CSV table of C-alpha atoms in Angstrom, one decimal:
chain,number,residue,atom,x,y,z
A,1,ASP,CA,39.4,87.0,81.8
A,2,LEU,CA,37.6,84.5,84.1
A,3,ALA,CA,41.0,82.7,84.2
A,4,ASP,CA,42.5,85.7,86.1
A,5,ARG,CA,39.9,85.4,88.9
A,6,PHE,CA,40.6,81.6,89.3
A,7,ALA,CA,44.3,82.3,89.4
A,8,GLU,CA,43.6,85.1,91.9
A,9,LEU,CA,41.7,82.7,94.2
A,10,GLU,CA,44.6,80.3,93.9
A,11,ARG,CA,46.8,83.0,95.3
A,12,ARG,CA,44.5,83.7,98.3
A,13,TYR,CA,44.3,80.1,99.6
A,14,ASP,CA,47.6,78.7,98.4
A,15,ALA,CA,45.9,76.1,96.3
A,16,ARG,CA,45.6,74.6,92.8
A,17,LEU,CA,42.1,75.0,91.3
A,18,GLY,CA,40.5,72.8,88.7
A,19,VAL,CA,37.2,73.9,87.2
A,20,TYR,CA,35.2,72.5,84.2
A,21,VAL,CA,31.7,73.3,83.0
A,22,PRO,CA,30.7,71.4,79.8
A,23,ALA,CA,29.5,73.7,77.1
A,24,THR,CA,25.9,74.0,76.1
A,25,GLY,CA,24.0,75.4,73.1
A,26,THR,CA,24.2,78.9,74.4
A,27,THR,CA,27.3,79.0,76.6
A,28,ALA,CA,31.0,78.3,76.0
A,29,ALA,CA,32.9,75.7,78.1
A,30,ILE,CA,34.6,77.0,81.2
A,31,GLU,CA,38.1,75.6,81.6
A,32,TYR,CA,40.7,76.2,84.2
A,33,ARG,CA,43.3,73.4,84.8
A,34,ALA,CA,40.5,71.2,83.3
A,35,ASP,CA,42.8,68.5,81.9
A,36,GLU,CA,45.1,68.2,84.9
A,37,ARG,CA,44.9,65.2,87.2
A,38,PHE,CA,43.2,65.6,90.6
A,39,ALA,CA,42.5,62.9,93.3
A,40,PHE,CA,39.2,61.2,93.4
A,41,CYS,CA,38.6,61.0,97.2
A,42,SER,CA,34.9,60.5,98.0
A,43,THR,CA,33.9,61.8,94.5
A,44,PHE,CA,33.8,58.2,93.0
A,45,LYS,CA,30.9,57.2,95.4
A,46,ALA,CA,28.5,58.8,92.9
A,47,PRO,CA,29.4,56.9,89.8
A,48,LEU,CA,29.9,53.8,92.0
A,49,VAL,CA,26.3,53.7,93.0
A,50,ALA,CA,25.4,54.0,89.3
A,51,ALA,CA,27.8,51.1,88.5
A,52,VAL,CA,25.9,48.8,90.9
A,53,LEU,CA,22.6,50.0,89.5
A,54,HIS,CA,24.0,49.4,86.0
A,55,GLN,CA,24.8,45.7,86.4
A,56,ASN,CA,21.9,44.6,88.6
A,57,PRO,CA,18.1,44.8,88.6
A,58,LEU,CA,16.3,46.9,91.2
A,59,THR,CA,15.4,43.9,93.4
A,60,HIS,CA,19.2,43.5,94.1
A,61,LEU,CA,19.0,46.5,96.4
A,62,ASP,CA,17.2,44.2,99.0
A,63,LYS,CA,20.1,41.8,99.4
A,64,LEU,CA,21.3,42.1,103.0
A,65,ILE,CA,25.0,42.4,103.6
A,66,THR,CA,26.6,41.4,107.0
A,67,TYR,CA,30.0,42.7,108.2
A,68,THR,CA,32.1,42.8,111.3
A,69,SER,CA,33.5,45.6,113.4
A,70,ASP,CA,36.9,44.9,111.9
A,71,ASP,CA,35.7,46.0,108.5
A,72,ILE,CA,34.9,49.6,109.7
A,73,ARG,CA,38.1,51.5,109.0
A,74,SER,CA,37.0,55.0,107.7
A,75,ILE,CA,34.4,57.7,108.4
A,76,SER,CA,31.2,55.6,108.7
A,77,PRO,CA,28.4,57.4,110.6
A,78,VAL,CA,25.7,54.8,109.4
A,79,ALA,CA,27.7,51.6,109.3
A,80,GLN,CA,28.9,52.0,112.9
A,81,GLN,CA,25.3,51.5,114.0
A,82,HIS,CA,24.3,48.3,112.2
A,83,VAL,CA,27.2,45.9,112.9
A,84,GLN,CA,24.8,43.5,114.5
A,85,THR,CA,21.8,43.8,112.2
A,86,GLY,CA,23.6,44.3,108.9
A,87,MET,CA,22.7,46.6,106.0
A,88,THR,CA,21.1,45.9,102.7
A,89,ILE,CA,22.6,47.0,99.4
A,90,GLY,CA,19.9,49.7,99.1
A,91,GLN,CA,20.8,51.2,102.5
A,92,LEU,CA,24.5,51.0,101.6
A,93,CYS,CA,23.8,53.1,98.5
A,94,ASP,CA,21.8,55.6,100.6
A,95,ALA,CA,24.6,55.8,103.2
A,96,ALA,CA,27.4,56.0,100.7
A,97,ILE,CA,26.0,59.1,98.9
A,98,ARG,CA,23.9,61.0,101.5
A,99,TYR,CA,26.4,60.6,104.3
A,100,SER,CA,29.7,59.8,102.4
A,101,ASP,CA,29.9,56.5,104.4
A,102,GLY,CA,33.4,55.0,103.8
A,103,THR,CA,32.5,51.5,104.9
A,104,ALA,CA,29.4,51.3,102.6
A,105,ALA,CA,31.7,52.4,99.7
A,106,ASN,CA,34.1,49.6,100.3
A,107,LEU,CA,31.3,47.0,100.5
A,108,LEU,CA,29.8,48.4,97.2
A,109,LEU,CA,33.2,47.8,95.6
A,110,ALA,CA,33.2,44.2,96.7
A,111,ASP,CA,29.7,43.9,95.3
A,112,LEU,CA,31.2,44.9,91.9
A,113,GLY,CA,33.7,42.0,92.3
A,114,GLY,CA,36.8,41.3,90.3
A,115,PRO,CA,40.5,41.9,91.1
A,116,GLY,CA,41.6,44.5,93.5
A,117,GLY,CA,38.4,44.5,95.5
A,118,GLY,CA,36.4,46.0,92.6
A,119,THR,CA,38.8,48.8,91.5
A,120,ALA,CA,39.3,47.1,88.2
A,121,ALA,CA,35.6,46.7,87.6
A,122,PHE,CA,34.9,50.4,88.5
A,123,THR,CA,37.6,51.7,86.1
A,124,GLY,CA,36.1,49.4,83.5
A,125,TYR,CA,32.8,51.0,84.1
A,126,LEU,CA,34.2,54.5,83.5
A,127,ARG,CA,35.8,53.3,80.2
A,128,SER,CA,32.3,52.2,79.0
A,129,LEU,CA,31.2,55.9,79.4
A,130,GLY,CA,34.2,57.2,77.3
A,131,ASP,CA,36.5,58.2,80.2
A,132,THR,CA,40.0,56.8,79.2
A,133,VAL,CA,41.8,59.0,81.8
A,134,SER,CA,40.4,58.4,85.3
A,135,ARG,CA,41.3,55.3,87.3
A,136,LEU,CA,40.7,53.9,90.8
A,137,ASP,CA,43.4,51.8,92.4
A,138,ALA,CA,42.8,51.5,96.1
A,139,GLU,CA,39.9,51.3,98.7
A,140,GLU,CA,38.9,53.5,101.6
A,141,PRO,CA,40.7,55.1,103.2
A,142,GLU,CA,43.9,54.7,101.3
A,143,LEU,CA,42.6,56.3,98.1
A,144,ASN,CA,42.9,59.7,99.8
A,145,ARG,CA,46.6,59.4,100.6
A,146,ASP,CA,48.4,59.1,97.3
A,147,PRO,CA,51.3,61.6,97.0
A,148,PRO,CA,51.1,64.6,94.6
A,149,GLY,CA,52.1,63.7,91.1
A,150,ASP,CA,51.0,60.1,91.4
A,151,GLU,CA,48.5,59.1,88.8
A,152,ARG,CA,46.7,56.5,90.9
A,153,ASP,CA,43.1,57.2,92.0
A,154,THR,CA,43.0,60.4,89.9
A,155,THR,CA,40.6,62.1,87.6
A,156,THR,CA,40.3,65.5,85.9
A,157,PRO,CA,37.6,68.2,86.0
A,158,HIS,CA,37.1,67.6,82.3
A,159,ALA,CA,36.7,63.8,82.7
A,160,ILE,CA,34.5,63.6,85.8
A,161,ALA,CA,32.2,66.4,84.7
A,162,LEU,CA,31.4,64.5,81.4
A,163,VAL,CA,30.8,61.3,83.3
A,164,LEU,CA,28.4,63.0,85.7
A,165,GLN,CA,26.7,64.5,82.7
A,166,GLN,CA,25.7,61.1,81.2
A,167,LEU,CA,24.5,59.8,84.6
A,168,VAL,CA,22.1,62.6,85.5
A,169,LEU,CA,21.3,64.4,82.3
A,170,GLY,CA,22.2,61.6,79.8
A,171,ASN,CA,21.1,58.1,79.1
A,172,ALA,CA,23.8,56.1,81.0
A,173,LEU,CA,21.0,54.8,83.3
A,174,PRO,CA,17.3,53.9,82.7
A,175,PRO,CA,14.8,56.4,84.2
A,176,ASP,CA,13.8,54.4,87.2
A,177,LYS,CA,17.4,53.9,88.3
A,178,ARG,CA,18.3,57.5,87.3
A,179,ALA,CA,15.7,58.7,89.7
A,180,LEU,CA,17.2,56.9,92.7
A,181,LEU,CA,20.7,58.3,92.0
A,182,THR,CA,19.5,61.9,91.6
A,183,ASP,CA,17.3,61.7,94.7
A,184,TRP,CA,20.1,60.5,96.9
A,185,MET,CA,22.4,63.2,95.6
A,186,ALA,CA,19.6,65.7,96.2
A,187,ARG,CA,19.3,64.7,99.9
A,188,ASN,CA,23.1,64.9,100.5
A,189,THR,CA,24.0,66.3,103.9
A,190,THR,CA,27.8,67.0,103.5
A,191,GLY,CA,27.9,69.8,100.8
A,192,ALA,CA,26.1,72.6,102.5
A,193,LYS,CA,29.2,74.9,102.6
A,194,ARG,CA,30.7,74.2,99.2
A,195,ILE,CA,29.1,74.6,95.7
A,196,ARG,CA,25.6,74.9,97.3
A,197,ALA,CA,26.9,77.9,99.3
A,198,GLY,CA,28.2,79.7,96.2
A,199,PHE,CA,24.9,79.6,94.2
A,200,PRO,CA,21.7,81.7,95.0
A,201,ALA,CA,19.0,79.8,96.9
A,202,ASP,CA,16.6,79.8,93.9
A,203,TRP,CA,19.1,77.5,92.0
A,204,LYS,CA,18.5,73.8,92.7
A,205,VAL,CA,21.7,72.0,93.7
A,206,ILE,CA,22.6,68.3,93.9
A,207,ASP,CA,26.2,67.4,94.7
A,208,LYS,CA,28.7,64.8,96.0
A,209,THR,CA,31.7,66.0,98.0
A,210,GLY,CA,35.2,64.7,98.4
A,211,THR,CA,37.9,65.3,101.0
A,212,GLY,CA,41.4,63.9,101.7
A,213,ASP,CA,44.9,64.7,102.8
A,214,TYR,CA,47.2,67.3,101.2
A,215,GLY,CA,44.3,69.8,101.6
A,216,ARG,CA,42.2,68.0,99.0
A,217,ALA,CA,38.6,69.1,98.7
A,218,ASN,CA,36.3,68.4,95.7
A,219,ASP,CA,32.7,68.9,94.9
A,220,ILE,CA,30.9,67.7,91.7
A,221,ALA,CA,27.3,69.0,91.2
A,222,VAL,CA,24.4,69.5,88.7
A,223,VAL,CA,22.7,72.8,89.1
A,224,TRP,CA,19.4,74.1,87.7
A,225,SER,CA,18.8,77.8,87.0
A,226,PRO,CA,15.6,79.5,88.2
A,227,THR,CA,14.2,78.9,84.7
A,228,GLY,CA,15.2,75.2,84.7
A,229,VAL,CA,18.4,75.1,82.6
A,230,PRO,CA,20.8,72.4,83.7
A,231,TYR,CA,24.6,72.8,84.0
A,232,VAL,CA,27.4,70.5,85.3
A,233,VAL,CA,30.0,72.0,87.6
A,234,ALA,CA,33.2,70.3,88.5
A,235,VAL,CA,35.3,72.0,91.2
A,236,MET,CA,38.5,70.4,92.6
A,237,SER,CA,41.3,71.7,94.7
A,238,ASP,CA,44.4,70.6,96.6
A,239,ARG,CA,47.1,72.2,98.7
A,240,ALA,CA,50.2,70.1,98.1
A,241,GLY,CA,52.6,72.8,99.2
A,242,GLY,CA,51.4,72.4,102.8
A,243,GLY,CA,52.3,68.7,103.1
A,244,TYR,CA,50.3,65.7,104.2
A,245,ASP,CA,48.7,67.6,107.0
A,246,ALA,CA,47.4,70.6,104.9
A,247,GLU,CA,43.9,71.5,105.9
A,248,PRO,CA,41.3,71.8,103.1
A,249,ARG,CA,39.6,75.1,102.5
A,250,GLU,CA,35.9,74.9,102.0
A,251,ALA,CA,35.5,78.6,101.3
A,252,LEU,CA,37.6,78.2,98.1
A,253,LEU,CA,35.1,75.9,96.5
A,254,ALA,CA,32.2,78.2,97.6
A,255,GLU,CA,33.9,81.2,96.1
A,256,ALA,CA,34.7,79.6,92.8
A,257,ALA,CA,31.1,78.5,92.4
A,258,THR,CA,30.0,82.1,92.7
A,259,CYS,CA,32.4,83.0,89.8
A,260,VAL,CA,30.6,80.3,87.7
A,261,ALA,CA,27.2,81.5,88.7
A,262,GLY,CA,28.0,85.0,87.5
A,263,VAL,CA,29.0,83.7,84.1
A,264,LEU,CA,26.0,81.4,83.7
A,265,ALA,CA,23.5,84.2,84.6
């Protein structure tokens, strides 16, 4: 019966909705278009920070990276201010998650090394977690522009939710590194009107947003009930019917999160 409300929200916004909440000991898994491919957009910037933390010790965050003004080719509120001074790997992680900095994301990919600017290394990291579906193929800002139906730079609510589960609630990272990733996601500034807006204020919310063309708007989050019970929420949406210039609807993600909160209560 919850599937009829999701299909009702799809009618209201002219969108395609993907939702997945992994099942716990007391609740059944919520699925709606869970195993259908959706575009990553900025969603990968959360497991990417975990990938750099995974292959390098904590002192590697102090290595200073220098770049030129020609390297800034996407939304970069922080990288635009340090083209003369440079930015350390640690500040690049903080900028990539808390501000969705596109230039810091591309530099992190080059820090991962390998073919394709690091896209092969990143997909290789996801496979080590058990995700044999998702794949990253391009860098910013091209990874938001793939046409509908293309399998490049895609994930599924089923796949990305289980990856986020291991990184925040699981053992994919040691505790000291797990604390830095969770704290950055906790001080995010770009998700105030999506999943966070659909849950009551006494629920703690950490999230990482994504936005692209074709009206694509994603938000992946970990929420804590007022008692302290954790859940993983993956909400993804696109509006392919409207073309390349379709505007994303933030209210859709906030509404669907209220539907999930009513079930988990």
